[PDB]
Design a protein around this ligand. Structure first.
Ligand SMILES: O=C(O)CC[C@H](O)C(=O)O
Ligand SMILES: [Mn+2]
Length: 228
């Protein structure tokens, strides 16, 4: 089915119908007027961040380059390979940018301290893919630029997702969601799921341990908040 979209639900409604039972939802009307939504053009990103070093996932390999280099080589003109400025705490590195986002009020329903929320940037061209995996905290994934196709499988379906057997990769599925090898992974075909296209100004709540797969449909910038 499709992930439900709710306009500014109350704290109590979010807590009781989504957070506690662990059900995904898209929050509308919450981040849609954060400054980032209008300010973060490529040129703005170059002006504020261009000379800073960032980690870039290529393909598979992990490298380092400036933001200006990342934009030149992997975004504009005609890139040779897929590169993704993924899972990077850009807002700790560049506090000016932190002024363009906010901590969602819903995070205060958690048990953790605000100081310990991890804020990551996800900036890349059309076609970046984060394979199906699960994380150990709650997440608000805020879409700023472009759209993402997202598939969500409940932790109750873990047996059908064939996690990798190493402790290191045990949080990641062996299956390629959009082209699954059903000869090797036959249980995957019948596993139920939710999906959405997440658009600018929308927030996706990914419950703790919910399996998620993400493909960028356009040049994309997302900001995740990992919280408890
Ligand atoms: O947006 C992506 O490509 C991955 C999002 C990530 O898995 C998260 O935990 O926020
Ligand atoms: Mn994740």
């Amino acid at each position: 089915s499709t992930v439900p979209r709710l306009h500014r639900p109350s704290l109590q409604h979010f807590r009781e119908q989504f957070l506690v039972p662990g059900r995904p939802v898209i929050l509308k009307g919450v981040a849609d007027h954060w400054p980032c939504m209008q300010k973060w053009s490529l040129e703005y990103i170059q002006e504020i961040a261009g000379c800073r070093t960032v980690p870039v996932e290529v393909g598979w390999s992990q490298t380092l380059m400036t933001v200006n280099e990342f934009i030149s080589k992997y975004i504009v003109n005609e890139p040779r390979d897929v590169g993704y400025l993924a899972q990077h705490q850009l807002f700790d590195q560049i506090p000016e940018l932190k002024q363009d986002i906010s901590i969602p009020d819903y995070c205060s329903l958690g048990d953790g301290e605000e100081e310990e929320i991890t804020i990551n940037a996800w900036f890349g061209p059309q076609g970046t893919i984060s394979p199906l995996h699960q994380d150990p905290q709650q997440n608000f994934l805020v879409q700023v630029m472009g759209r993402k196709y997202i598939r969500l499988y409940s932790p109750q379906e873990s047996g059908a997702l064939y996690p990798h057997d190493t402790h290191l990769l045990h949080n990641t599925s062996q299956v390629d969601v959009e082209n699954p090898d059903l000869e090797k992974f036959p249980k995957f075909a019948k596993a139920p799921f939710l999906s959405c296209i997440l658009s600018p100004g929308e927030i996706l709540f990914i419950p703790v341990k919910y399996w998620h797969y993400v493909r960028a449909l356009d040049l994309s910038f997302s900001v995740s908040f990992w919280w408890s």
